Scaffold this active site. Structure first.
Site, PDB file in Angstrom:
ATOM      1  N   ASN A  33     -36.708  47.647   5.500  1.00 49.30           N
ATOM      2  CA  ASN A  33     -37.145  48.854   6.187  1.00 49.30           C
ATOM      3  C   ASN A  33     -36.702  48.776   7.644  1.00 49.30           C
ATOM      4  O   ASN A  33     -36.866  47.737   8.291  1.00 49.30           O
ATOM      5  CB  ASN A  33     -38.646  49.010   6.110  1.00 49.30           C
ATOM      6  CG  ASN A  33     -39.069  50.429   6.360  1.00 49.30           C
ATOM      7  OD1 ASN A  33     -38.707  51.319   5.606  1.00 49.30           O
ATOM      8  ND2 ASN A  33     -39.789  50.657   7.449  1.00 49.30           N
ATOM      9  N   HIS A 213     -40.540  73.527  -3.131  1.00 53.27           N
ATOM     10  CA  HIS A 213     -40.670  73.453  -1.684  1.00 53.27           C
ATOM     11  C   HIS A 213     -39.785  74.483  -1.015  1.00 53.27           C
ATOM     12  O   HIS A 213     -40.132  75.007   0.036  1.00 53.27           O
ATOM     13  CB  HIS A 213     -40.307  72.056  -1.172  1.00 53.27           C
ATOM     14  CG  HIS A 213     -41.336  71.005  -1.459  1.00 53.27           C
ATOM     15  ND1 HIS A 213     -41.431  69.851  -0.718  1.00 53.27           N
ATOM     16  CD2 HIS A 213     -42.313  70.929  -2.400  1.00 53.27           C
ATOM     17  CE1 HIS A 213     -42.430  69.117  -1.174  1.00 53.27           C
ATOM     18  NE2 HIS A 213     -42.988  69.753  -2.189  1.00 53.27           N
TER      19      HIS A 213
HETATM   20  N1  LIG Z   1     -45.042  60.218  -1.663  1.00 51.37           N
HETATM   21  C1  LIG Z   1     -44.942  61.194  -2.659  1.00 51.37           C
HETATM   22  O1  LIG Z   1     -45.923  61.438  -3.339  1.00 51.37           O
HETATM   23  C2  LIG Z   1     -43.630  61.970  -2.885  1.00 51.37           C
HETATM   24  C3  LIG Z   1     -43.712  63.109  -3.606  1.00 51.37           C
HETATM   25  C4  LIG Z   1     -42.610  63.858  -3.857  1.00 51.37           C
HETATM   26  C5  LIG Z   1     -41.386  63.466  -3.349  1.00 51.37           C
HETATM   27  N2  LIG Z   1     -41.278  62.331  -2.609  1.00 51.37           N
HETATM   28  C6  LIG Z   1     -39.928  61.943  -2.127  1.00 51.37           C
HETATM   29  O2  LIG Z   1     -39.920  60.337  -1.899  1.00 51.37           O
HETATM   30  C7  LIG Z   1     -39.416  60.136  -0.659  1.00 51.37           C
HETATM   31  C8  LIG Z   1     -40.078  58.969   0.059  1.00 51.37           C
HETATM   32  O3  LIG Z   1     -41.438  59.337   0.172  1.00 51.37           O
HETATM   33  P1  LIG Z   1     -42.569  58.412   0.854  1.00 51.37           P
HETATM   34  O4  LIG Z   1     -43.850  59.120   0.686  1.00 51.37           O
HETATM   35  O5  LIG Z   1     -42.578  57.018   0.248  1.00 51.37           O
HETATM   36  O6  LIG Z   1     -42.091  58.384   2.394  1.00 51.37           O
HETATM   37  P2  LIG Z   1     -42.768  57.360   3.452  1.00 51.37           P
HETATM   38  O7  LIG Z   1     -44.102  56.918   2.983  1.00 51.37           O
HETATM   39  O8  LIG Z   1     -42.747  58.148   4.705  1.00 51.37           O
HETATM   40  O9  LIG Z   1     -41.765  56.011   3.642  1.00 51.37           O
HETATM   41  C9  LIG Z   1     -40.487  55.909   3.189  1.00 51.37           C
HETATM   42  C10 LIG Z   1     -39.871  54.685   3.928  1.00 51.37           C
HETATM   43  O10 LIG Z   1     -38.643  54.939   4.366  1.00 51.37           O
HETATM   44  C11 LIG Z   1     -38.553  54.659   5.947  1.00 51.37           C
HETATM   45  N3  LIG Z   1     -37.726  55.758   6.492  1.00 51.37           N
HETATM   46  C12 LIG Z   1     -38.002  57.019   6.803  1.00 51.37           C
HETATM   47  N4  LIG Z   1     -36.886  57.606   7.273  1.00 51.37           N
HETATM   48  C13 LIG Z   1     -35.897  56.709   7.239  1.00 51.37           C
HETATM   49  C14 LIG Z   1     -34.583  56.795   7.600  1.00 51.37           C
HETATM   50  N5  LIG Z   1     -33.974  57.968   8.108  1.00 51.37           N
HETATM   51  N6  LIG Z   1     -33.754  55.736   7.470  1.00 51.37           N
HETATM   52  C15 LIG Z   1     -34.264  54.586   6.995  1.00 51.37           C
HETATM   53  N7  LIG Z   1     -35.569  54.510   6.630  1.00 51.37           N
HETATM   54  C16 LIG Z   1     -36.395  55.571   6.741  1.00 51.37           C
HETATM   55  C17 LIG Z   1     -39.808  54.714   6.372  1.00 51.37           C
HETATM   56  O11 LIG Z   1     -40.158  53.828   7.515  1.00 51.37           O
HETATM   57  P3  LIG Z   1     -40.445  54.513   8.967  1.00 51.37           P
HETATM   58  O12 LIG Z   1     -41.649  55.320   8.856  1.00 51.37           O
HETATM   59  O13 LIG Z   1     -40.598  53.429   9.985  1.00 51.37           O
HETATM   60  O14 LIG Z   1     -39.247  55.358   9.226  1.00 51.37           O
HETATM   61  C18 LIG Z   1     -40.693  54.284   5.163  1.00 51.37           C
HETATM   62  O15 LIG Z   1     -40.906  52.933   5.106  1.00 51.37           O
HETATM   63  C19 LIG Z   1     -39.824  61.385   0.062  1.00 51.37           C
HETATM   64  O16 LIG Z   1     -38.947  61.560   1.060  1.00 51.37           O
HETATM   65  C20 LIG Z   1     -39.535  62.477  -0.995  1.00 51.37           C
HETATM   66  O17 LIG Z   1     -38.038  62.518  -0.840  1.00 51.37           O
HETATM   67  C21 LIG Z   1     -42.390  61.561  -2.385  1.00 51.37           C
END
Ligand SMILES: NC(=O)c1ccc[n+]([C@@H]2O[C@H](COP(=O)([O-])OP(=O)(O)OC[C@H]3O[C@@H](n4cnc5c(N)ncnc54)[C@H](OP(=O)(O)O)[C@@H]3O)[C@@H](O)[C@H]2O)c1
Ligand SMILES: NC(=O)c1ccc[n+]([C@@H]2O[C@H](COP(=O)([O-])OP(=O)(O)OC[C@H]3O[C@@H](n4cnc5c(N)ncnc54)[C@H](OP(=O)(O)O)[C@@H]3O)[C@@H](O)[C@H]2O)c1
Lengths: 424, 418
Positions: A33, A213
């Site tokens: 990360n 979305h």
């Molecule tokens: N969570 C859900 O229920 C859900 C539902 C529908 C779809 N999704 C999809 O799954 C994806 C990931 O979701 P999530 O909820 O796990 O997101 P998250 O909790 O915000 O974390 C994703 C990881 O990626 C890192 N990150 C963010 N932007 C980055 C970048 N530009 N380059 C490198 N690393 C980056 C983040 O660390 P930092 O914060 O330090 O950047 C974080 O550790 C979402 O974007 C969406 O596309 C998720």
């Protein structure tokens, strides 16, 4: 099979995936990360002996579990050629950046790369960015298979999964790919059915957030709530004026589904039945609200009936019709998800949340790709213009100096790389 | 032009009407309330000096109180029927019309389709009374407690009601427009009674929503959650099928109105402009005005949107989260035992079934089968029949037992053919 697995991005999705991977038996499990407050907090927890924790909410409590992480990197310089599988758990709009940034010279042993939340063109875009002679297979999962969030950002390794999908789809850049079955099994451990499809684009054509979305969170109501500091945030899945759902937004949903379906046909993928996809693969309602004959017949029903049925679908889910009623007869309000709003980062600059920035970026790339297939996509273009005009007015009002540059893009280069990759 | 006014049915509606009459200007004020406990409390209250008291607000003296229609003197120019509409025929048949030649006007405050004609079929040959049909009561009014039986509270006033007359050129119709307008309601005179009778929201809404399976299951239940009258399934009765019944019933009622010489209504425009509006974002003005010509699928969609849009009050103030007031959470009133220990049905849906039963029987004379109305009647009859089966007929008030509306329908049709 999976060998040693490196999770790229360690957020809510990654923690759920890690639990399912440890059930299956990864081998070594690592995570990368990029630097920041989250990675610092993770390294601190890990050094304290913390493990990843997944709680299932309510019905899903049986999912709950703990999973060990063998290594965590916030610095790609220390990665070595120890990894057979890469799992991209970063936001889908960062796949290109993240893939370019991996140290591929030290990753020759990678055999598979899984995109957990793919969109139309993502597989091709990722492959366009790989080094020459990279022989990793790239897998596209249609959608993340649950709803999960990190409840407390100060306990970055604890996540809560409050919903699990019934079905998702998985495609691969390798024909008749054997890794599809491996991932079918991994996700089956949490109760989701993975359906293997013949190409990446077929699976990507079943990404739920692109269809949902885009019409709901790029329109006027959502943008007004998201770009606001003072008023009430409102609710993502309620009807106007509590939320963004209106007959106009439903009409955008239908028309966008038609445009995306035609794009899929031109890329050799079979489009989906939007109503049956929502109901059967994501979350259902009773036959009283959506009859089986109406679900199965949706694609031939005619535009007025299609819009009526979609509206019914969302109105019927303002409360959970399968939850227990209380003594008054009320069911659980699970349309009460607030909109996240703009907020200042540690440099004092306004940033947008993933809803809608990721949603915009994905749709903008899809529109640019569609141009190469001679598809204008006017409804998608109208939604992009709605976002662009709203964010523009927010910069006007707040001051460009106060705004992160992500609010300011050109999707044509990435779309060109995708089309060239497709044409190889 | 009002003269001395006799209020028949001294309840909540009558007390509001009394104050509006007094604001306007009238002669003596009398009331006829049939024997019963309410009448006994009124008699005592009057004996102790009570007057009619309205709170929104004002007071009105009652000059004469009767229980027995045979005791009426020929001293009344206007009669106002403030009783349940199902009692209009009974009330009129019971009055000694042959020695009430001074009555010039009879006003029906909540007239159903055919009520004007049904009332007239019961008058003596030669009777000179004009009969006025008001489309519905124009307010929301209740007697708070029966220990102060002549004190009523009006909660709200409607925007608009409609008024028609058995007499083509009718002085009394303009008088009553002015009388009722003192409450703030707008009274729209129409050229026939049936045009006004066809503009009652409950006929169009209560029939499809509250005579269906879900509502009857709530209403006939003793235990369990009561559910909500205006929510979507499973919290309330509103489903695409109930909206489909609403559309088809409106079509049937609209054809009946045309065969009876009345212009029907645009159902969506009526709900939005006469009952409660929604924002342009949910129902564009052009969709509202074009509803009658839209075609059945679009019509059903628009109706569903209308009710979904009013699960909360879109014009209420938002809380800090952005929630609006939940004014669809009207709970079902359910069966209850009366003073004699016998199960009674609430006015909703008892009065609604009785009205539709008469409408269907009347429509048969105009060669209209009304299959959707009949399906709603059968759903009510089957559910109540089962309830009687389970509880015991001895345990049920006779108002639950079968009715036969064909004699009244026949009288309406004979009157209309004269
Ligand atoms: N969570 C859900 O229920 C859900 C539902 C529908 C779809 N999704 C999809 O799954 C994806 C990931 O979701 P999530 O909820 O796990 O997101 P998250 O909790 O915000 O974390 C994703 C990881 O990626 C890192 N990150 C963010 N932007 C980055 C970048 N530009 N380059 C490198 N690393 C980056 C983040 O660390 P930092 O914060 O330090 O950047 C974080 O550790 C979402 O974007 C969406 O596309 C998720
Ligand atoms: N009140 C409202 O806000 C409202 C709103 C919409 C529609 N409505 C309708 O308007 C009409 C009047 O409602 P309401 O609230 O005033 O009813 P109410 O409070 O029950 O008063 C009805 C009065 O008439 C008496 N009555 C019943 N049958 C009679 C008869 N055959 N002859 C003489 N008196 C009789 C009743 O006495 P007993 O009780 O002893 O029978 C009672 O005093 C009803 O049809 C109602 O459904 C009312």
């Amino acid at each position: 099979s999976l060998g040693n697995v490196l999770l790229v991005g360690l957020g809510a999705v990654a923690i759920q995936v890690a639990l399912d991977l440890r059930r299956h038996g990864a081998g070594r499990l690592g995570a990368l990360n990029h630097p920041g407050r989250r990675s610092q907090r993770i390294a601190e927890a890990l050094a304290r002996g913390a493990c990843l924790q997944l709680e299932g909410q309510g019905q899903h409590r049986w999912l709950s579990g703990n999973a060990a992480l063998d290594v965590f990197h916030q610095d790609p310089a220390e990665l070595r050629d120890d990894w057979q599988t890469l799992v991209l758990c970063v936001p889908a709009d960062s796949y290109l950046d993240v893939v370019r940034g991996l140290p591929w010279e030290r990753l020759g042993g990678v055999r598979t790369l899984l995109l957990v939340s793919a969109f139309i063109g993502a597989n091709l875009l990722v492959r366009s960015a790989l080094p020459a002679g990279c022989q990793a297979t790239v897998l596209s999962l249609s959608s993340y298979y649950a709803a999960t969030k990190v409840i407390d950002e100060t306990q970055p390794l604890r996540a809560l999964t409050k919903a699990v999908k019934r079905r998702v789809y998985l495609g691969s850049s390798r024909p008749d790919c054997p890794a599809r079955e491996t991932w079918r099994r991994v996700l089956a451990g949490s109760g989701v059915e993975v359906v293997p499809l013949a190409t990446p684009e077929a699976a990507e054509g079943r990404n739920v957030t692109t269809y949902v979305h885009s019409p709901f969170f790029l329109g006027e109501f959502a943008l007004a709530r998201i770009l606001s500091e003072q008023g009430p945030p409102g609710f993502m899945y309620k009807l106007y004026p509590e939320g963004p759902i209106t007959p106009g937004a439903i009409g955008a949903m239908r028309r966008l589904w038609c445009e995306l379906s035609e794009l899929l046909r031109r890329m050799g993928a079979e489009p989906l039945n939007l109503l049956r996809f929502l109901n059967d693969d994501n979350y259902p309602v009773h036959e009283t609200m959506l009859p089986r004959a109406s679900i199965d017949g949706f694609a031939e029903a005619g535009a007025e009936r299609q819009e009526y049925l979609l509206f019914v679908r969302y109105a019927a889910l303002l409360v959970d019709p399968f939850s227990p009623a209380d003594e008054q007869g009320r069911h659980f309000d699970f349309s009460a998800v607030p909109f996240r709003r703009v907020s200042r980062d540690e440099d004092g600059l306004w940033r947008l949340p993933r809803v809608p920035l990721e949603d915009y970026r994905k749709l903008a790339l899809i529109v640019a790709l569609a141009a190469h297939f001679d598809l204008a996509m006017p409804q998608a273009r109208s939604l992009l213009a709605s976002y662009e005009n709203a964010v523009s007015r927010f910069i006007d009002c707040q001051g460009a100096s106060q705004c992160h540059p992500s609010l300011y893009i050109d999707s044509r280069p990435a779309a060109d790389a995708i089309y060239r990759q497709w044409c190889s």
